[PDB]
């Protein structure tokens, strides 16, 4: 066994984040610190994202208060499947004990483009800093206005650019269908996928669209936990899955899915606006999974979380609390 402690954090965003569901001003979570008898230390982070699945930080806190003062693999196996961010935090903390700091690498990162005409002026600085895959928010203006911008954006992007269109579940079914018909006529080798064209409740239409239209579709809001990923694999989802590792469960569950029916080439790993402990843990896991698409970690505007390169850096973060 080994000893451990946990601390809540509540960190203001670097700037506010507006979504269709309201303005975000801070992120909260839990940091875990594990120490063995000798003095080796490991760290993990539990940060469920409000609105994304059923797990709440309050439920993770209750879990932390219910666990024994000494952890073992069998104790950690008692963590409910309904708390996948807690599963991620404890599993990554355990695996880090006496293994920090981790070897990590730059992976390509997807650059964001803001809704509307902004996209046409925001790709250049990112391109000039070596980002070649972009994600642009759609479903904000009328379809016809966005299609006109899209036509100009595709003409302007340099050779080799890739573009993701993120609807965030904001289209109704007839609108999605009209968009996919437009993309069949006017789309381009630069379009990688449409992300979450319909809200998660419209799963039958999402599946039918993916099975019939010519442009790839990615699930995002639909796939938070390992259980949701498995449900979509078993439905025969032919598109992409955007995996938020910090929210998903024990990382070993993704590897198990991959050994089974999930295709590595259909994964895109993205950020849940987590902190440096979780992000560094995810980059360590990427040394095994070896991603083949630009990561959805271009989120520094809202939450900057530089990877941790020294054990003292973890200790500073912890003591700062
Ligand atoms: Na999305």
From Swiss-Prot:
GO terms for molecular function: magnesium ion binding; O-succinylbenzoate synthase activity. One of its GO terms (biological process) is menaquinone biosynthetic process. Its cofactor is a divalent metal cation. Keywords: Lyase, Magnesium, Metal-binding. It catalyses: (1R,6R)-6-hydroxy-2-succinyl-cyclohexa-2,4-diene-1-carboxylate = 2-succinylbenzoate + H2O. The active site is at residues 137, 244. Its EC number is 4.2.1.113. Pfam families: MenC_N, MR_MLE_C. SMART domains: MR_MLE. Mg(2+) binds at residues 166, 195, 220. Pathway: Quinol/quinone metabolism; 1,4-dihydroxy-2-naphthoate biosynthesis; 1,4-dihydroxy-2-naphthoate from chorismate: step 4/7; Cofactor biosynthesis; phylloquinone biosynthesis. InterPro entries: Enolase-like_C_sf, Enolase-like_N, Enolase_C-like, Mandelate_racemase_C, OSB_synthase_MenC1, OSBS_N. Monomer. Belongs to the mandelate racemase/muconate lactonizing enzyme family. MenC type 1 subfamily. PANTHER family: O-SUCCINYLBENZOATE SYNTHASE (PTHR48073:SF2), O-SUCCINYLBENZOATE SYNTHASE-RELATED (PTHR48073). Converts 2-succinyl-6-hydroxy-2,4-cyclohexadiene-1-carboxylate (SHCHC) to 2-succinylbenzoate (OSB). Does not show N-succinylamino acid racemase (NSAR) activity with N-succinyl-L-phenylglycine as substrate. This is o-succinylbenzoate synthase.
């Amino acid at each position: 066994s080994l000893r451990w402690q946990w601390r809540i954090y509540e960190e203001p965003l670097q700037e506010p984040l507006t979504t269709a569901q309201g303005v975000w001003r801070s992120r909260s979570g839990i940091y875990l610190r594990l120490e063995d008898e000798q003095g080796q230390v490991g760290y993990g982070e539990i940060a469920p994202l409000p609105g994304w699945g059923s797990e709440t930080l309050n439920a993770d806190i209750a879990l932390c208060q219910q666990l024994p003062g000494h952890l073992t693999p069998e104790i950690m196996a008692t963590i409910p499947e309904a708390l996948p961010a807690a599963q991620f935090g404890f599993a990554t903390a355990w695996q880090s004990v006496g293994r920090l700091p981790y070897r990590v690498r730059p992976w390509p990162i997807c650059a964001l483009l803001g809704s509307g005409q902004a996209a046409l002026e925001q790709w250049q600085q990112s391109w000039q800093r070596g980002q070649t895959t972009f994600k642009w928010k759609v479903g904000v203006m009328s379809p016809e206005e966005e299609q006109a911008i899209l036509k100009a954006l595709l003409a302007a992007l340099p050779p080799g650019a890739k573009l993701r269109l993120d609807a965030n579940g904001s289209w109704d079914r007839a609108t999605a269908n009209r968009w996919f018909a437009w993309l069949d006529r006017h789309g381009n080798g630069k379009i990688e996928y449409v992300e979450q064209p319909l809200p998660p409740d419209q799963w039958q239409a999402l599946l039918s669209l993916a099975q019939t239209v010519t442009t790839a579709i990615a699930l995002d809001e639909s796939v938070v936990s390992a259980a949701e990923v498995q449900r979509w694999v078993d439905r025969g989802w032919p598109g992409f899955f955007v995996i938020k590792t910090a929210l998903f469960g024990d990382p070993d569950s993704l590897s198990l899915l991959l050994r089974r029916g999930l295709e590595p080439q259909r994964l895109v790993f993205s950020s849940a606006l987590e902190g440096a402990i979780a992000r560094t843990a995810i980059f360590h896991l990427l040394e095994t999974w070896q991603p083949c698409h630009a990561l959805g970690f271009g989120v520094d505007r809202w939450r900057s979380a530089p990877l941790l390169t020294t054990l003292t850096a973890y200790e500073r973060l912890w003591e700062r609390l």
